[PDB]
């Protein structure tokens, strides 16, 4: 019976488990979990910059100036935009918004606008501009989208309406305009006096026209009439020309793109809380140094890479043997 040296290996009281191709549920002495599965359940500032919280307003409601969205008439730079799935306050006067999804996509790379009064309402001296609707009422009286101008007959006449704006603002500018599609001929006559009217818009690259369509339609927000909006990005130093014999809904303002960068519209019913993050998801903010997470695929900011995994655990130590 003599002396001994034995070779052996570490064991401990670790219960950490990993999988292999050949075996599952192996206990190891040390392991590294590389998957973040937690978040704080809140919508936060992103690097100290708050999101734009639309509340009950849609993108269209904001930019057109639905009177229910007046808190948004001037907003500071944002880090992302929060929009509800079905915002209540959009087109108060019913209708449509051409290339709307394209406009929202643009907003993914815009972090601020400066709203510029490009076509001041008071310069429409040959037309009435006080036009509004009970569908956009404020304090019981007819009103209208704050950023738009409904031109109507003045003194029983509607002369050719021409407005133009040269973009001297120093950046590309978003401009929206509309055409009013009445319910009937009496509406057309009372509002515009003219028939067979048109709305023409022209820049160096855009030439888009419209003839209003009179037709009885199902009532929405009380009206069978509609307003159809369109938009363009006016390049620096380019001019936009509006020309109409009736039915033009003119912009008073343009939105100069004043800051660009990676942003996004987050779909959420929630509200901004007093918290800070580098990584925001629609479910809540992530604070981790782990390389992967499984929280949500639609994240904004400096985030880990998303995977569908329930677990990602790397063995680092050896098989833990009793």
């Amino acid at each position: 019976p003599g002396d001994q040296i034995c070779i052996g290996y570490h064991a401990n009281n670790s219960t950490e488990k990993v999988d292999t191709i050949l075996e599952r549920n192996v206990t190891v002495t040390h392991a590294k979990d590389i998957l973040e599965k937690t978040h704080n359940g809140k919508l936060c500032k992103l690097n100290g910059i708050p999101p734009l919280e639309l509340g009950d307003c849609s993108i269209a409601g904001w930019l057109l100036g639905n009177p229910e969205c007046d808190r948004l008439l001037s907003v500071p730079e944002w880090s992302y935009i929060m929009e509800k799935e079905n915002p209540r306050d959009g087109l108060c006067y019913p209708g449509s918004f051409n290339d709307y999804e394209e406009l929202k996509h643009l907003l993914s790379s815009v972090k601020h606008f400066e709203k510029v009064k490009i076509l001041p309402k008071d310069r429409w001296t040959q037309h009435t501009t006080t036009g509004g609707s009970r569908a956009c009422a404020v304090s019981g009286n007819p009103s209208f989208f704050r950023n738009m101008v409904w031109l109507t007959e003045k003194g029983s006449n509607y002369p050719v309406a021409k407005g133009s704006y040269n973009n001297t603002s120093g950046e590309q500018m978003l401009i929206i305009w509309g055409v009013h599609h009445p319910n009937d001929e009496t509406e057309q006559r009372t509002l515009y006096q003219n028939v067979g009217t048109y709305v023409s818009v022209g820049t160096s690259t855009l030439n888009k026209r419209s003839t209003p369509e009179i037709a009885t339609r199902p009532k929405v927000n009380g009206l069978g009439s509609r307003m159809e909006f369109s938009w363009t990005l006016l390049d620096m130093w380019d001019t936009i020309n509006f020309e109409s014999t009736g039915n033009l809904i003119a912009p008073e303002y343009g939105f100069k793109i004043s800051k660009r960068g990676s942003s996004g519209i987050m779909k959420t019913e929630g509200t901004l809380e007093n918290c800070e993050t580098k990584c925001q998801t629609p479910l809540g903010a992530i604070n981790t140094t782990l390389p992967f997470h499984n929280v949500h695929p639609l994240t904004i900011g400096e985030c880990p890479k998303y995977v569908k995994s329930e677990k990602l655990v790397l063995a680092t130590g050896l098989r833990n043997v009793p």
Partner: protein, 172 residues
């Protein structure tokens, strides 16, 4: 495992060896105790640290979903977008899960190899001055003091030194 040492001929681990992954337990007239082999532990630590960085770094070139919207007249386009974002998501989940599984397999076998190689290193040094018991231990054909055990643990055992002492023990 692949190399037959861990949960193999060395049947279990040592709770009493807290300072390393692999090492020694000695027993002599002066007493007994555990000691980690620092060299092999460090070499494995370096490899494992490299492994984890590699697995992470290769999956930093990963797809990100971008939020886009589509009209009720753009359902094919919407579906294409969804199939694409989901498709990449599935590919990257697959890459991550597979990489972790395959590399976990290799990590356990790496440790097994490191134990076997350490054992073999000591074996090939002690030669016939010891009996191989078959359990990870070598029983000496001579008294082996603390300084003697210390020589084995750092590969300075003098076999040419104990050569004659052991053969007499081994034969008598």
């Amino acid at each position: 495992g692949l190399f037959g040492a861990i949960a193999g001929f060395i049947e279990g681990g040592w709770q009493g060896m807290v300072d390393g992954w692999y090492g020694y337990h000695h027993s002599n007239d002066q007493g007994s105790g555990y000691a980690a082999d620092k060299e092999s532990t460090q070499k494995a630590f370096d490899g494992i640290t490299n492994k984890v960085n590699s697995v992470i770094e290769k999956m930093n070139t990963q797809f990100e979903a971008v939020g886009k919207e589509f009209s009720n007249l753009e359902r094919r386009l919407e579906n294409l977008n969804k199939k694409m974002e989901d498709g990449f998501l599935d590919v990257w989940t697959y890459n991550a899960e597979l990489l972790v599984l395959m590399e976990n397999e290799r990590t356990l076998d790496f440790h097994d190899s490191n134990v076997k190689n350490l054992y073999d290193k000591v074996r090939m040094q002690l030669r016939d001055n010891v009996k191989e018991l078959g359990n990870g231990c070598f029983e000496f054909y001579h008294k082996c003091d603390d300084e003697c055990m210390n020589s084995v643990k750092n590969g300075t055992y003098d076999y040419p030194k104990y050569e004659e002492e052991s053969k007499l023990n081994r034969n008598e």
